[PDB]
Coordinates of C-alpha atoms and ligand atoms in Angstrom, one line a residue:
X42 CA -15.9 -18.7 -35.1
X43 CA -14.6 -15.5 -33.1
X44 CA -11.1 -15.4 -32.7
X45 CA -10.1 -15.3 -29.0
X46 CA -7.5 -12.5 -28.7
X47 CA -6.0 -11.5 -25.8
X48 CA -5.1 -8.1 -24.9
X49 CA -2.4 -7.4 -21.9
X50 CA -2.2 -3.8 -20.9
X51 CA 0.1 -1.5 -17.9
X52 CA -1.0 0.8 -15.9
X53 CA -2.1 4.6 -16.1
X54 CA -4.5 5.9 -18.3
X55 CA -2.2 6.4 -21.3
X56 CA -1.2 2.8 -21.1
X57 CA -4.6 1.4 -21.1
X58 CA -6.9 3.5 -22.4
X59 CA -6.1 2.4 -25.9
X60 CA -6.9 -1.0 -25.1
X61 CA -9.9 -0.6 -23.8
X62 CA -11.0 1.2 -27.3
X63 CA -9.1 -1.4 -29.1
X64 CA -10.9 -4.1 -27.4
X65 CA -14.1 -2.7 -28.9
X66 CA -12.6 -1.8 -32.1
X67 CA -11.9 -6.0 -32.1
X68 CA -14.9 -7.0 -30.9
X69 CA -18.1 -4.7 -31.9
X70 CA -16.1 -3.8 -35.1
X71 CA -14.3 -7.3 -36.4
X72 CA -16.3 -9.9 -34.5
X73 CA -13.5 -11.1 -32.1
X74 CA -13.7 -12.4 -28.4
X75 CA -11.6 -10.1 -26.6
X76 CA -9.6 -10.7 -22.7
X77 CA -8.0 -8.0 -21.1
X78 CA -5.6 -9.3 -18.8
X79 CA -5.0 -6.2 -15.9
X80 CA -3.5 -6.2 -12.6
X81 CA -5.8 -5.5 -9.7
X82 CA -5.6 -3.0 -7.5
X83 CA -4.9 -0.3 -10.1
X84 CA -2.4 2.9 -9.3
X85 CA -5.3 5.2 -10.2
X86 CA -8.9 5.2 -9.8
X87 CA -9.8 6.4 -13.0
X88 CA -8.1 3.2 -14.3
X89 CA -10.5 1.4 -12.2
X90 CA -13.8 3.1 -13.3
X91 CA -12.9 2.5 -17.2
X92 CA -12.2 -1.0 -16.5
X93 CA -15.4 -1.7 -14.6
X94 CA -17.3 0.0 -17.0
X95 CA -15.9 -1.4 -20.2
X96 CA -16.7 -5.2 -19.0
X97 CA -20.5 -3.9 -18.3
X98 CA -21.0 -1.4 -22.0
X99 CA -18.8 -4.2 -24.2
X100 CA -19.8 -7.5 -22.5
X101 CA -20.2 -10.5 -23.2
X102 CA -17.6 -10.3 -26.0
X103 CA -14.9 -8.5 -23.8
X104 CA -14.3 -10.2 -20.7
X105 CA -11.9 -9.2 -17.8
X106 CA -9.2 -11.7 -17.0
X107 CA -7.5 -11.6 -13.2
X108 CA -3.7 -11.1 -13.0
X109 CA -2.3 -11.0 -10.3
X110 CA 1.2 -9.5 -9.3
X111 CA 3.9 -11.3 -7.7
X112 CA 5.4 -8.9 -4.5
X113 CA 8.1 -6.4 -6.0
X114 CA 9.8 -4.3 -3.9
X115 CA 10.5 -0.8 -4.6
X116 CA 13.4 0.1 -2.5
X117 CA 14.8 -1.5 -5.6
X118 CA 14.2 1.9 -7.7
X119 CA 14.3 5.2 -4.6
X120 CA 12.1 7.5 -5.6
X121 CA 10.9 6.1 -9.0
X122 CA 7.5 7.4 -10.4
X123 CA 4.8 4.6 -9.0
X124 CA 3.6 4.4 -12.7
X125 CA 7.2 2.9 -13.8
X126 CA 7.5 0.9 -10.3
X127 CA 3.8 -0.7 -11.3
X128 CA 5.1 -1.2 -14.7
X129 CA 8.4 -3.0 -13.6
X130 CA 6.4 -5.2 -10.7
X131 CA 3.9 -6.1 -14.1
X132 CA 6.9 -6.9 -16.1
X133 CA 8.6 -9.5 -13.3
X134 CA 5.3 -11.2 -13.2
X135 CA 5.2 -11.7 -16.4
X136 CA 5.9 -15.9 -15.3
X137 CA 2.7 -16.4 -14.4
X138 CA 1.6 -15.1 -18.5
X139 CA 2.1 -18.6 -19.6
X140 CA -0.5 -20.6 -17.6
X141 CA -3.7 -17.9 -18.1
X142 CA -2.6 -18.0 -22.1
X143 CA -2.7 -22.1 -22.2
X144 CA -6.2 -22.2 -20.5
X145 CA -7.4 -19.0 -23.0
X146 CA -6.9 -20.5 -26.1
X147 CA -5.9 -17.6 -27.5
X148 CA -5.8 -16.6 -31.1
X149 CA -3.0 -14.2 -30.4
X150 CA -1.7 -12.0 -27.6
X151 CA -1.5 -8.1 -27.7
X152 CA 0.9 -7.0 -25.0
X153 CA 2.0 -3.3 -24.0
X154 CA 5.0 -2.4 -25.3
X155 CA 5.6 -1.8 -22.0
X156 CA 5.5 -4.6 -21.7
X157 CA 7.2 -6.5 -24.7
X158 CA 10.4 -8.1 -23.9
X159 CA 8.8 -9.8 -21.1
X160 CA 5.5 -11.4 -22.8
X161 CA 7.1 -12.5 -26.2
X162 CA 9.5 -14.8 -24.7
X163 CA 6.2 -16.1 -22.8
X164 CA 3.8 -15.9 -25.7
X165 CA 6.8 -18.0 -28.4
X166 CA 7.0 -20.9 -25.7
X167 CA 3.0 -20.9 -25.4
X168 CA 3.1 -21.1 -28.7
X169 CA 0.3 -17.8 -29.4
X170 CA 1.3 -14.8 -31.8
X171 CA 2.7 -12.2 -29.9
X172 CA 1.6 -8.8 -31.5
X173 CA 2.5 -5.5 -29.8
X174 CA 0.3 -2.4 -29.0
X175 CA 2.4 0.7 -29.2
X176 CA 0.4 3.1 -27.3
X177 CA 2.1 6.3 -28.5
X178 CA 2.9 8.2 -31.6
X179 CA 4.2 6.4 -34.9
X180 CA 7.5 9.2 -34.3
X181 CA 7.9 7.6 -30.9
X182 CA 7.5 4.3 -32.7
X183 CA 10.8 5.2 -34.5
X184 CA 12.3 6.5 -32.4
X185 CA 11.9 3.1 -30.0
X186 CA 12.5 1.4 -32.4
X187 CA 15.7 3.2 -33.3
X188 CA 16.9 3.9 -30.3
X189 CA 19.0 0.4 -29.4
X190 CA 20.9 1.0 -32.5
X191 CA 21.3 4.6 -32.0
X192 CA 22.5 3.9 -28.1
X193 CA 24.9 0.7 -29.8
X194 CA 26.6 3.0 -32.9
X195 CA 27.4 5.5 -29.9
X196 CA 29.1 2.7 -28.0
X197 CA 32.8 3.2 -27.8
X198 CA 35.0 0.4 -25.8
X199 CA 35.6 1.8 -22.3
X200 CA 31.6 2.6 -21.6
X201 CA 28.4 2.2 -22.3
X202 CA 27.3 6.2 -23.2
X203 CA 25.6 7.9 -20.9
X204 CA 23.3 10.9 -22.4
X205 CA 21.4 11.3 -25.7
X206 CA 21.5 13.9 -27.9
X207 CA 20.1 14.8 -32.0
X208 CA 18.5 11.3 -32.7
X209 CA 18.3 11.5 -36.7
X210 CA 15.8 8.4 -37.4
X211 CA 16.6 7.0 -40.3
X212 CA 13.9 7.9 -43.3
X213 CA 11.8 9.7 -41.2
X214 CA 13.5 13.5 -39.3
X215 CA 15.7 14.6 -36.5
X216 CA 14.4 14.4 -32.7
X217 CA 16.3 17.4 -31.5
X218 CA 18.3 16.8 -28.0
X219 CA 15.7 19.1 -26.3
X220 CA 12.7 16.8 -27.4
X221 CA 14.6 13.8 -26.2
X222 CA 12.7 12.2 -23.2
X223 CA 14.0 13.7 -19.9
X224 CA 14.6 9.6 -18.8
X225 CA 16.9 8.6 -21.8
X226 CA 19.5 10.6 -21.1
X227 CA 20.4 8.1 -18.0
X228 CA 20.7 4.8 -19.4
X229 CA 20.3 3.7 -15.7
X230 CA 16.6 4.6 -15.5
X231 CA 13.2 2.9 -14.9
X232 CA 11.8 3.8 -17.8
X233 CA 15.2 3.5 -19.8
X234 CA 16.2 0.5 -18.9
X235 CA 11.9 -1.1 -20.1
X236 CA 12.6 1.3 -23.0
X237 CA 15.4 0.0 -24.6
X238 CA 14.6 -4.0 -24.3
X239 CA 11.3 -3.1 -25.4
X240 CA 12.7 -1.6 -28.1
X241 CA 15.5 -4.7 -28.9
X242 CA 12.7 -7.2 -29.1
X243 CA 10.1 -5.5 -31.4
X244 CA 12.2 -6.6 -34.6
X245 CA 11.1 -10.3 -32.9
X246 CA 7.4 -10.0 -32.9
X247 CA 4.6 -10.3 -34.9
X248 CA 3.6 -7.1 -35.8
X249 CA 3.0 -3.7 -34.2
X250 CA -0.4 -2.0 -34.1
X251 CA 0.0 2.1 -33.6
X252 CA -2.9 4.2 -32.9
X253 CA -2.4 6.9 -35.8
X254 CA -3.3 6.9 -39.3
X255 CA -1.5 7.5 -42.3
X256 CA -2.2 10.5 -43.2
X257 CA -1.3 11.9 -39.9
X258 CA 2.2 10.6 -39.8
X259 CA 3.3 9.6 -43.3
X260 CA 6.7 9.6 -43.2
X261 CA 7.2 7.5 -39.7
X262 CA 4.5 5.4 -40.9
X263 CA 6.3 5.2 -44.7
X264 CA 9.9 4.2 -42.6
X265 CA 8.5 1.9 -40.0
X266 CA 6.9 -0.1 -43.2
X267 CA 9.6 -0.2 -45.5
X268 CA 12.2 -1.1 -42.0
X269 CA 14.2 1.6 -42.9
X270 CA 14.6 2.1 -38.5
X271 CA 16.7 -1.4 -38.1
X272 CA 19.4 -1.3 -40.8
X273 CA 19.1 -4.9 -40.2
X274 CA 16.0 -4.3 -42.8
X275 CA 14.0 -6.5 -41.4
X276 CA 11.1 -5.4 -39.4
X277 CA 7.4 -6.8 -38.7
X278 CA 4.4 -5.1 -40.3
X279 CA 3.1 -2.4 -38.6
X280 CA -0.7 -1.8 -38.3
X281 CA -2.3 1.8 -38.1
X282 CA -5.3 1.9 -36.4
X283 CA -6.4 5.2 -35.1
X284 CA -7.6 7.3 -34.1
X285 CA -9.2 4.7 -32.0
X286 CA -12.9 6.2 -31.5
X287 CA -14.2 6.6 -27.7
X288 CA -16.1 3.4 -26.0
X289 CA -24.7 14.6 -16.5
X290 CA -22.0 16.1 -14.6
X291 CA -21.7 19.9 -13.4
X292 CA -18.9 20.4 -15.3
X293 CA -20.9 19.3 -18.7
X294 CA -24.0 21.2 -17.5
X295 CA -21.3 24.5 -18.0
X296 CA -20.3 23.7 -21.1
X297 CA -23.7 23.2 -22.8
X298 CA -24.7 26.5 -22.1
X299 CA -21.9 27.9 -23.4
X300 CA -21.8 29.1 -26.9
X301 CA -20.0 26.8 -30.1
X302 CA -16.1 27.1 -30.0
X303 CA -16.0 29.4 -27.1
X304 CA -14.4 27.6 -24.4
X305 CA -10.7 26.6 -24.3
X306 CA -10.7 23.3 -22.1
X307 CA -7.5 22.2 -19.9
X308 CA -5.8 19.3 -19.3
X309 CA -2.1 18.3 -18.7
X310 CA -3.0 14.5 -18.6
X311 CA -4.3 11.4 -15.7
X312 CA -0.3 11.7 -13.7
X313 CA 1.0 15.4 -14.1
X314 CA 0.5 17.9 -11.2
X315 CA 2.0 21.4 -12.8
X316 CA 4.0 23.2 -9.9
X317 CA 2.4 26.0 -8.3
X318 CA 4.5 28.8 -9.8
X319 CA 3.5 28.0 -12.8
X320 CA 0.1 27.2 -12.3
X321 CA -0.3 30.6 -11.2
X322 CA 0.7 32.1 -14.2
X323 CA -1.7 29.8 -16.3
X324 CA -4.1 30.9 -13.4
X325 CA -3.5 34.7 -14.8
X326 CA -3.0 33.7 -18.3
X327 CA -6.4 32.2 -18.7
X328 CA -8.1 35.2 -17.0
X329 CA -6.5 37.8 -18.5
X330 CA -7.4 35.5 -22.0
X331 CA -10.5 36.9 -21.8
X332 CA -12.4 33.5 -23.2
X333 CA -14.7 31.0 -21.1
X334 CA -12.5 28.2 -19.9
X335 CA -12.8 24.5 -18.6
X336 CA -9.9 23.6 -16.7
X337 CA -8.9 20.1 -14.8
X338 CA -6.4 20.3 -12.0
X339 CA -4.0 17.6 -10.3
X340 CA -2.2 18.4 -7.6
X341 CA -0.2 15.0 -7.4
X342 CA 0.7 12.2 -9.9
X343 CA -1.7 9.9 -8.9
X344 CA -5.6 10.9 -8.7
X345 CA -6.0 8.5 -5.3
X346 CA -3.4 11.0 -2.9
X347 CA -5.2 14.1 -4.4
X348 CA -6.1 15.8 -1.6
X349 CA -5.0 19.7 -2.0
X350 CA -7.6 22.3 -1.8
X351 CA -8.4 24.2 -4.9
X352 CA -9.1 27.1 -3.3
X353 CA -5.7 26.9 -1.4
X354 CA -3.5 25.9 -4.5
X355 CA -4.4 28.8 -7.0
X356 CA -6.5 31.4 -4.6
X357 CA -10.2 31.9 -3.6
X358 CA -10.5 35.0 -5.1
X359 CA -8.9 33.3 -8.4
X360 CA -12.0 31.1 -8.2
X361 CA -14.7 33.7 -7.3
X362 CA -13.4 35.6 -10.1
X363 CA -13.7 33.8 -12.2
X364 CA -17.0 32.4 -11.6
X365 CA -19.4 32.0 -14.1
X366 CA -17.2 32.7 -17.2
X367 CA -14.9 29.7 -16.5
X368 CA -15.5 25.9 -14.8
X369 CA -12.6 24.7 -12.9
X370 CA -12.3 21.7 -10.8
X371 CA -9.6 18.8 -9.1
X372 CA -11.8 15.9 -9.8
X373 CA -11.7 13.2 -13.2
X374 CA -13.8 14.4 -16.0
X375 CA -14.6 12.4 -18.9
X376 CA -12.6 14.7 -21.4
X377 CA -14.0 12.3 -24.3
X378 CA -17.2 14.0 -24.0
X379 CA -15.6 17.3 -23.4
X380 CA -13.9 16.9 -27.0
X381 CA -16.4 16.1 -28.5
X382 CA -18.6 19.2 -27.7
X383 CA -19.4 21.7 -29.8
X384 CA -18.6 24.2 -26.9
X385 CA -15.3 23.7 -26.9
X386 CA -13.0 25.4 -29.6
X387 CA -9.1 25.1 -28.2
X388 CA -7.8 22.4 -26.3
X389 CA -4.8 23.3 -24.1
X390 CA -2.9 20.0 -23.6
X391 CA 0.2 18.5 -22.2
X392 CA 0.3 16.1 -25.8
X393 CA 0.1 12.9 -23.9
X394 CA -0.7 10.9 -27.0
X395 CA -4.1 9.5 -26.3
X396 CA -5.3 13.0 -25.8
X397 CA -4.3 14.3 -28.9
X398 CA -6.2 11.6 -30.7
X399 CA -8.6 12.7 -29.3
X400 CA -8.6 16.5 -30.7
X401 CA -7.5 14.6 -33.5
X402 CA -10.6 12.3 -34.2
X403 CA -13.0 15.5 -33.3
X404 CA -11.1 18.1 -35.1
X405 CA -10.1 20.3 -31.7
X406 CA -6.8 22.9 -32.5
X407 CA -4.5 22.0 -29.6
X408 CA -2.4 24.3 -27.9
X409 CA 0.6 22.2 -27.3
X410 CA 2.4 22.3 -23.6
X411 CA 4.1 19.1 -23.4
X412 CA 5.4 18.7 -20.0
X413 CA 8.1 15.0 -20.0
X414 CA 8.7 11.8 -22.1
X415 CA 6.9 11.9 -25.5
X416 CA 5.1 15.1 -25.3
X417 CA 8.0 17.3 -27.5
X418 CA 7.9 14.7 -30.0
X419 CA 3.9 14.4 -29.7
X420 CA 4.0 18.3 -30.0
X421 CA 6.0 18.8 -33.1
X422 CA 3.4 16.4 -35.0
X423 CA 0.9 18.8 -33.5
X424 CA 2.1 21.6 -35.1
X425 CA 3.4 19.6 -38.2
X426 CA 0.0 18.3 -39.1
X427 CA -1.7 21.3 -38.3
X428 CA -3.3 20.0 -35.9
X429 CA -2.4 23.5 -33.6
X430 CA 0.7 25.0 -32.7
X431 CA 3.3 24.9 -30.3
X432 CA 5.6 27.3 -29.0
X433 CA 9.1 25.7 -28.8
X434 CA 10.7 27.8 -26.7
X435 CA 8.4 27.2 -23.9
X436 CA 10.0 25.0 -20.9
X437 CA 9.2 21.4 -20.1
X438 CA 10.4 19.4 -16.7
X439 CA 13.4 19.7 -15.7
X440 CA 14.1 23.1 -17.3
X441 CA 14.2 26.4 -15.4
X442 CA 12.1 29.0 -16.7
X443 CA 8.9 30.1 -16.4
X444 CA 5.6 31.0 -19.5
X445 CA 4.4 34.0 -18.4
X446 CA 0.5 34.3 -17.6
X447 CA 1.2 37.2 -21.1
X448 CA 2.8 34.5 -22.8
X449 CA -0.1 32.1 -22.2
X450 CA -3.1 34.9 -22.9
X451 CA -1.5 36.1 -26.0
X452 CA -0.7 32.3 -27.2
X453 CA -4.9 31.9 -26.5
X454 CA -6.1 34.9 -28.1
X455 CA -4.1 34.1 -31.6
X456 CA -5.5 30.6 -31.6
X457 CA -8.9 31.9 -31.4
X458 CA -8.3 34.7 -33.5
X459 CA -6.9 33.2 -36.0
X460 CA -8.9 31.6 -38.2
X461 CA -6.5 29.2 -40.6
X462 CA -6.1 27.5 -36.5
X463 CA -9.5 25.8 -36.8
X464 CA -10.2 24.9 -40.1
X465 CA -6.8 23.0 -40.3
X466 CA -7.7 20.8 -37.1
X467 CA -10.6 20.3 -39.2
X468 CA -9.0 18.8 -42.1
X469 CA -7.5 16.9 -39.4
X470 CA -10.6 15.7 -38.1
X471 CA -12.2 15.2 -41.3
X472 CA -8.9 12.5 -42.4
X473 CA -9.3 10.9 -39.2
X474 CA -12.8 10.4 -39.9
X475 CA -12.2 8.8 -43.2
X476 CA -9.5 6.6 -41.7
X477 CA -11.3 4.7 -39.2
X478 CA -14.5 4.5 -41.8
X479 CA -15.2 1.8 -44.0
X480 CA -12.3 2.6 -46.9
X481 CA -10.6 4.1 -44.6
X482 CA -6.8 3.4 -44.1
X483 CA -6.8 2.6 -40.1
X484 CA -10.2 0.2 -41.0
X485 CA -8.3 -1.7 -43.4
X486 CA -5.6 -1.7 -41.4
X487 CA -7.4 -3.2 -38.6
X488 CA -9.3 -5.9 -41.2
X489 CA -5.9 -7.1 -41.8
X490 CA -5.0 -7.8 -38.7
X491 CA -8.0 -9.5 -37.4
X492 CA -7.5 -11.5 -40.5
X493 CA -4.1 -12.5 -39.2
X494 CA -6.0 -13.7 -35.9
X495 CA -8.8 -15.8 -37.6
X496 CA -5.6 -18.3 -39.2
X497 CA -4.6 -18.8 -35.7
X498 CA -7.3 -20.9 -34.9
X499 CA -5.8 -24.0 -33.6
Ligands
UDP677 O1 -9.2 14.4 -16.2 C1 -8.9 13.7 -17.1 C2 -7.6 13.4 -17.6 C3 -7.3 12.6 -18.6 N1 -8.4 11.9 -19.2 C4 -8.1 10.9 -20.3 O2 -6.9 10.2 -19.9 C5 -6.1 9.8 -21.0 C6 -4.8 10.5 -20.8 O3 -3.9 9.8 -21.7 P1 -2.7 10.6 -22.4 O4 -2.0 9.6 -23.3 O5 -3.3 11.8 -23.1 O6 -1.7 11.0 -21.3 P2 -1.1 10.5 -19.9 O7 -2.1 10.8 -19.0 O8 -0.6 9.0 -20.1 O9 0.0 11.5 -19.7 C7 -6.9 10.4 -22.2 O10 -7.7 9.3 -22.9 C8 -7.8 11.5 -21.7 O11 -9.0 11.6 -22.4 C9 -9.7 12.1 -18.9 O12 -10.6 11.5 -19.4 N2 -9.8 13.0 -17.8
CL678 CL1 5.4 11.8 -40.1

């Protein structure tokens, strides 16, 4: 009998990419009926495109379920990013949760932890297991998980403290202030204000599942198992189970007649849009590199208002330039494949986690450039696990400074250069590898907790 489990994702890319490769994960791999209950229309296209094609390539064990969204209105949160107001109109509709989990019969429930504080309340009343899919690092795990008791020991009568600063998660580092999320330092935020009751009800649920592997993140995984993060010490078990594996164009026409581990490909993620002065200088930076190079533009957050000319937001003599040696274009591509092409041999990316898991799972050195939120934590594993490297010095949003199209060349030359770069992102690689295989620690991992589902039959 297949366990009926079902999976409630948010929006943008980051968000619900790793459910779609968990779904299959559950279903090709452990034999589970899968729903994923998503909100339709979807902020970005690309969302809608993996959707669509998930329900066709994993059918008929994963099957789409329809949620829709009550009216929200934003005037509520000026100027917001549409990703957070989609996440805070999901989380107010979170009501209508309770009926669509009676008729499912589910086994359990896998909610966002975007989602979280809303759907466990839901899920204990419906009386399903409520599991939670952090979609980020297992340091960001600690540090969510952390932060209510980090933001409460730093409460003082008079106020509730605005600002962050050093974060020291217990039993597993420091966050420094700088690689604090831009968002947490106002406690008054979108994203703060999800982050922090998402955070507060985790010790409540049934068990996390994170999208690493052991060996990747030992100490955060080693703290977030013992509970060392609550003080309380009690915390549910957490379940690694990355990296979670993937489910012809022009640009891939390129890159196969290019030679192995000559082109450094570029991405800053599916919602950042790099400002022009800078992009200019990692215009000049990747010419003046001197190496082939496969680079993905945005010029707003969301790929649906991206209407800006290429040609007119870095130059058309930029572009004609650089024809031939380099492929660079404003539309999606399916950096999946990219990553796992033998082309490719550096990977300059924002750290958006799902990304790196990517390079991770196909041994890729990454050249980090994190940009907001998670990506200076994301980074620091980066260059901890070897991985790549990651100059800290460079600024993020919300800084003013500039790297210099020198700064960028030189940083590309030495990870090319330098040999000891690739053959430790292939020891990454090759422990990723091992970990989703059969003896591996994310398989297990993963065994265990479609176990946990099949004694939820009821
Ligand atoms: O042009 C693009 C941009 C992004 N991605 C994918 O979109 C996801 C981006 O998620 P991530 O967590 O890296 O960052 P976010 O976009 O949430 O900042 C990853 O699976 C990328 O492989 C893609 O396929 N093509
Ligand atoms: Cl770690």
């Amino acid at each position: 009998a297949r366990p009926h489990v079902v999976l409630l994702p948010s929006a943008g890319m980051g968000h619900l990419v790793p459910f779609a490769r968990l779904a299959v994960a559950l279903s090709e791999g452990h034999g589970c009926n899968v729903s994923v209950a998503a909100v339709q229309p979807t902020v970005s296209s690309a969302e809608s495109r993996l959707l669509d094609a998930l329900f066709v390539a994993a059918a008929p064990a994963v099957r789409r379920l329809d949620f829709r969204l009550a009216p929200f209105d934003e005037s509520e949160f000026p100027g917001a990013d549409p990703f957070f107001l989609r996440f805070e109109a999901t989380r107010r509709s979170a009501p209508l949760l309770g009926p669509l989990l009676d008729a499912a019969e589910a086994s359990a429930l896998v909610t966002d932890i975007v989602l979280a504080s809303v759907a466990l309340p839901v899920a204990r009343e419906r009386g399903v297991p409520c599991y939670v899919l952090f979609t980020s690092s297992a340091a960001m795990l600690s540090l969510c998980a952390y932060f209510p008791a980090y933001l409460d020991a730093h409460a003082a009568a008079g106020s509730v403290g605005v600002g962050v600063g050093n974060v020291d998660i217990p039993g597993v580092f420091r966050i420094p202030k700088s690689s604090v999320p831009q968002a947490l330092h106002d406690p008054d935020h979108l994203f703060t204000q999800q982050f922090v009751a998402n955070g507060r009800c985790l010790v409540a649920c049934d068990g996390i599942l994170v999208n690493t592997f052991d060996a990747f993140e030992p100490d955060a995984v080693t703290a977030l198992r013992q509970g060392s993060i609550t003080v309380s010490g009690g915390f549910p078990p957490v379940f690694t189970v990355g990296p979670m594996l993937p489910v012809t164009a022009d640009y891939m026409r390129w890159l196969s007649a290019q030679p192995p581990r000559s082109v450094v490909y570029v991405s800053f993620g599916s919602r950042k849009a790099i400002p022009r002065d800078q992009l200019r200088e990692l215009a000049a930076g990747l010419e003046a590199s001197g190496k082939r190079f496969l680079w993905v533009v945005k010029s707003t957050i969301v790929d649906r208002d991206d209407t800006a000319d290429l040609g007119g937001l870095l130059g058309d003599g930029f572009l004609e330039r650089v024809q031939g040696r380099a492929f660079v274009t404003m539309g999606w591509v399916e950096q999946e494949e990219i990553l796992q092409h033998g082309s490719v041999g550096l990977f300059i990316s924002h750290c958006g986690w799902n990304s790196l898991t990517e390079a991770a799972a196909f041994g890729v050195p990454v050249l980090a450039w994190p940009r907001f939120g998670d990506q200076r934590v994301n980074a620091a594993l980066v260059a901890r696990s070897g991985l790549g490297a990651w100059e800290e010095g460079w600024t993020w949003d919300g800084e003013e400074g500039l790297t210099t199209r020198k700064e960028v060349a030189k940083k590309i030359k030495g990870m090319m250069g330098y040999d000891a770069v690739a053959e430790k992102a292939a020891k990454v690689g090759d422990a990723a590898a091992a970990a989703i295989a059969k003896c591996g620690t994310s398989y297990q991992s993963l065994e265990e907790f479609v176990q946990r589902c099949r004694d939820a039959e009821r």
